[PDB]
Nucleic acid binder design. Structure first.
Lengths: 115, 117
DNA sequence: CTATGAACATAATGTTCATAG
DNA sequence: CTATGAACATTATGTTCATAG
């Protein structure tokens, strides 16, 4: 893949993985949390990208689905996420550190030569 | 609705590099490619030739640069297409955009790198 | 070989519609 | 309305081929 910058889905997948570590999340939650979290910097990911990233982590057997009901005040069906293979997660999280690390390096090298 | 505001595209990354190298040297596709291929090899980014040739032809169609069909040799006789500035303000302006781009891009990586690890 | 470029190919990610609380 | 998707569309890019020096 010509060794360029970290793909978007990898960038999300990383975020899902970490947020599963702390809370229980589903698609539209993570999206809105991210949408907010970045708004300033200016990155505004779409929903279908999130749902793609998620289903990969499924097919990769890192995570698994549960069809629960998060009420609050209503009675809505919502697909929540938990770890299937948490070693698998740990491993991928480490790869993504490496990825981000290069990604930083490139940006900082470009940013150094050209300006 | 945007290009969702994520990381800098590859072609921008190259276009940037062409623009700066034109400032300093005369360059053509295969030269810039090999220079970049080397320059990054450690970090691990190995761009291909057709990506380079795309980036170049944009800068053309954008009227930043223009072709110069010459024969830089040494011990040969061989056509290479060097580029020079067509509209150098146009360049300056784009280079500034790309600073902005790179600046966000850093911000994102550093933010992701902060939260998740 | 180097070099350029078209043509073809698919990968990554955006947009719209279907369908269920 | 939210939430999940699937379907459809396009752009951003990798792979290979036709030329020529």
């Amino acid at each position: 893949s010509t060794g360029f910058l970290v793909k978007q889905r990898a960038f999300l997948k990383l975020y899902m993985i970490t947020m599963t570590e702390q809370e229980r999340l589903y698609g539209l939650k993570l999206l809105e949390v991210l949408r907010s979290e970045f708004k300033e910097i200016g990155f505004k990911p779409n929903h279908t990208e999130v749902y793609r990233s998620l289903h990969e982590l499924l097919d990769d057997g890192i995570l698994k689905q549960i069809k629960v009901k998060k009420e609050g005040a209503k009675l809505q069906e919502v697909v929540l996420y938990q770890f299937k293979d948490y070693e698998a997660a740990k491993l991928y999280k480490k790869q993504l550190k490496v990825e981000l690390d290069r990604s930083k390096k490139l940006i900082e090298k470009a940013l150094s030569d050209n300006f």
